[model samples]
Target: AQDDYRYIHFLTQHYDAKPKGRNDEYCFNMMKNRRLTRPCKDRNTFIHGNKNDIKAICEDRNGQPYRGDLRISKSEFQITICKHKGGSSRPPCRYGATEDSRVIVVGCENGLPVHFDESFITPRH
Candidate 1:
């Protein structure tokens, strides 16, 4: 499924690790390259930090597994979110970025993420 690929691809592409200063160009290319530009993705989806850290989510089982509940040390980190500004249009496209240092409360099935629920924007001290 492309959905599955897209999620994993997002990690593999290292979009989470890219950019010092993100601009329209960065968003444009990243969305395009990831084939996430079909009318331009207009939402908040990000996986921050190391790729291996994401894979670590699969092993976590503290939460309800079937409900996509999985929390691990890897989830407690920073992630990125990119959203379209104004509306979706070529050339005049605008985007905004936000950084979230949260524990990813994701939904996993068979050791993989299916649904991204919410996140705790702070670390557990």
Candidate 2:
């Protein structure tokens, strides 16, 4: 039951120039931040009250899963939420070569990853 609880982190990228056709496509990247990982004492620890109430309280203020599909590696576990078709002033996107734009979310359940209502996974410049 302790493993049921997880820590969530939000990673977002901003574009320098707003797209011509698009409405300022903001690249909202999310991943499991290991440093924030924590254990869940029980189901009530998160939603509180009853287990059936989970569906309603699964997401936080930003609409992210409280626990879901987690990609596990030898040393870390993560889940990729979305890679919007935009840019960022803070990160400064590069023409070529991948940068550390990858944001990490940590402490997710064994088989539950957050999925957005829109695009699952997209690429950008």
Candidate 3:
């Protein structure tokens, strides 16, 4: 049950309400710190951006959440994927609000994967 599934959509940090370049750093730091508590759940997972313009998704063979330091930088907008423990009967028990806050996805359509931009949260938008 943890080696056949892949991909999970997530929300981005509020960037529009933050300073110009500060948004990326904020997100980077948030993910970096989340590593200590909620490491990646799998090792063969792939992450990608969605069409929403402010969210991303991570696909993994294992249902376990990634556990480890995220591979994100303070200058770029991205998502991290890794191996993590499983069997919680719940969705993202830890960091699901601050360090791992999952966004409210409106649902996919036409079997198409949702995508978003990192700068969509920018204030100038």
Largest TM-score belongs to which candidate?
Answer: 1
- Using TM-score as the measure, what is the rank order of every candidate, best first? 1, 3, 2
- List, residue by residue over 68-120, the lDDT tens digit for candidate 3: 31111222333332333344334342222112123322222222223322222
Per-model TM against the reference: 0.64, 0.16, 0.18
**Is candidate 1 or 3 superior in TM-score?**
1
TM-score of 3: 0.18
Q: Candidate 3 lDDT (Cα, whole model)?
A: 0.28
Model 3 spans with C-alpha error above 4 angstroms = 1-8, 12-25, 33-125
Question: Cα miss at 67, model 2 (Å)?
Answer: 15
Question: Per-residue CA lDDT of candidate 2, range 12-113, in tens?
Answer: 121122222211112111112121211211110011122222222233332243244432112111222223223423333211212222222323233333
Residue 112 error, candidate 3, Å: 4.2
Give the least accurate 10-residue stretch of model 2, judged by summed lDDT.
40-49
Model 1 per-residue lDDT at 55 = 59
Q: Please, what are the lDDT tens digits per residue for candidate 1 over residues 54-120?
A: 6556665433343435544444656566677875766456567665666666656665654565444
Q: Largest lDDT belongs to which candidate?
A: 1
Per-residue lDDT of 87 in model 3: 43
Pairs in clash, predicted candidate 1:
68-107, 68-108
